[PDB]
Amino acid sequence: VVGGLVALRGAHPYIAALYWGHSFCAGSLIAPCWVLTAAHCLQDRPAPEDLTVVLGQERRNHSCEPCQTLAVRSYRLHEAFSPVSYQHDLALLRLQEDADGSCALLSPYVQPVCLPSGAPSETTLCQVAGWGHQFEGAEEYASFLQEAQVPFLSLERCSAPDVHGSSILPGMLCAGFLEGGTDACQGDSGGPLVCEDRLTLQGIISWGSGCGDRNKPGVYTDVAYYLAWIREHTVSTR
Ligand SMILES: *[C@@H]1O[C@H](CO)[C@@H](O[C@@H]2O[C@H](CO)[C@@H](O[C@H]3O[C@H](CO)[C@@H](O)[C@H](O)[C@@H]3O)[C@H](O)[C@H]2NC(C)=O)[C@H](O)[C@H]1NC(C)=O
């Protein structure tokens, strides 16, 4: 996150850290057993046994008193996810219940975030959070989680020829300052864009041109657009 701030412990208790191989992504816990992220993150289609999800984590790849480490049962990328257009950039993970029957154990550090209903949030208080780059082409991802306030943007305004033009396709959503300076960056993807009335996951950190460049707001998967997709993909192993 560029132009952001170190967050308090538990500031974003719905953020998920995804680790596999020599790879990393973020995600958003939407229910005790369910995590939402970007499709591009898991492009490489790792076997689900290879994934580790860490909940309630303050620092990238650090153990912590309230950290929770779960396996993954199964997961699904959106069938139509395009790595040309970046359209339909989301994926849904079903976590693995521990030997008692529980997935995420709710705590002050580990908490799902409601989905929207898309009935729709012009210029509310919206925060983005992540462990990604603190500036474009930084050398390492952040250690402590970062947060930034970032305003929603109209499609009209975002699709303007000198902003993002016709790159912005249905299922996408812009959020950022046209003047630049604050934004998501590489390493923030899968992670939450959250807005308030009530706290709801409006966006999934997806793509962008640079990080917080003038007339280049971050693009996000429009969660509300995919509510049906999400419902109909809640099948799981037993
Ligand atoms: C930091 O990133 C690491 C990836 O580089 C990640 O390593 C993973 O950690 C878990 C242990 O929690 C391992 O899981 C399995 O290990 C043995 C079986 O061999 C079992 O006893 C365990 O129950 C479990 O099934 C993963 O194998 C390991 N993955 C890799 C790729 O090495 C860490 O979890 C990350 N740590 C934090 C705190 O974020």
Side-chain angles (χ1 to χ4, degrees):
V1 166
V2 317
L5 305 162
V6 166
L8 293 169
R9 276 166 149 279
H12 305 270
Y14 36 76
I15 197 160
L18 275 65
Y19 308 87
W20 72 104
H22 292 129
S23 288
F24 170 76
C25 265
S28 303
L29 188 72
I30 62 183
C33 294
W34 294 100
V35 166
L36 214 56
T37 180
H40 77 248
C41 269
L42 297 164
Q43 252 173 19
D44 54 321
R45 259 91 166 171
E49 57 266 30
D50 293 334
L51 290 162
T52 308
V53 179
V54 189
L55 300 173
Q57 183 157 59
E58 186 183 33
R59 306 176 76 207
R60 205 193 72 237
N61 205 222
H62 275 82
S63 323
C64 81
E65 211 85 62
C67 282
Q68 277 178 71
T69 295
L70 293 80
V72 175
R73 263 192 191 273
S74 66
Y75 71 85
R76 256 291 171 105
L77 274 63
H78 195 283
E79 290 84 8
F81 166 62
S82 165
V84 182
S85 68
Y86 296 159
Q87 184 174 31
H88 308 314
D89 191 12
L90 86 171
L92 177 66
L93 283 73
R94 177 61 162 75
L95 302 165
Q96 181 63 63
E97 289 79 355
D98 59 40
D100 313 303
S102 38
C103 288
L105 305 167
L106 299 193
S107 78
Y109 306 99
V110 169
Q111 213 69 39
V113 54
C114 301
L115 293 177
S117 88
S121 298
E122 183 70 48
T123 312
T124 326
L125 219 79
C126 296
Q127 297 141 35
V128 77
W131 290 278
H133 285 152
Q134 273 147 311
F135 58 92
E136 168 177 11
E139 227 138 68
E140 294 218 327
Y141 288 153
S143 180
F144 292 82
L145 179 69
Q146 306 279 304
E147 45 174 32
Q149 298 237 323
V150 76
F152 180 105
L153 279 181
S154 179
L155 198 102
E156 269 217 63
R157 270 144 65 220
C158 188
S159 67
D162 47 4
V163 179
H164 282 307
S166 44
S167 279
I168 309 303
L169 301 165
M172 296 188 195
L173 177 167
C174 315
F177 308 96
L178 288 169
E179 61 265 31
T182 282
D183 206 357
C185 210
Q186 276 75 57
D188 285 330
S189 267
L193 184 72
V194 149
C195 310
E196 68 195 34
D197 221 314
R198 174 56 60 207
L199 211 47
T200 69
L201 179 66
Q202 287 301 126
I204 300 159
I205 300 156
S206 178
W207 64 274
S209 168
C211 307
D213 287 335
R214 214 177 93 85
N215 288 337
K216 300 304 185 222
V219 189
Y220 294 74
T221 306
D222 179 346
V223 172
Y225 193 85
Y226 291 99
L227 289 165
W229 186 87
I230 297 169
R231 278 199 169 202
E232 84 189 47
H233 283 72
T234 70
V235 321
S236 188
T237 60
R238 290 187 170 182

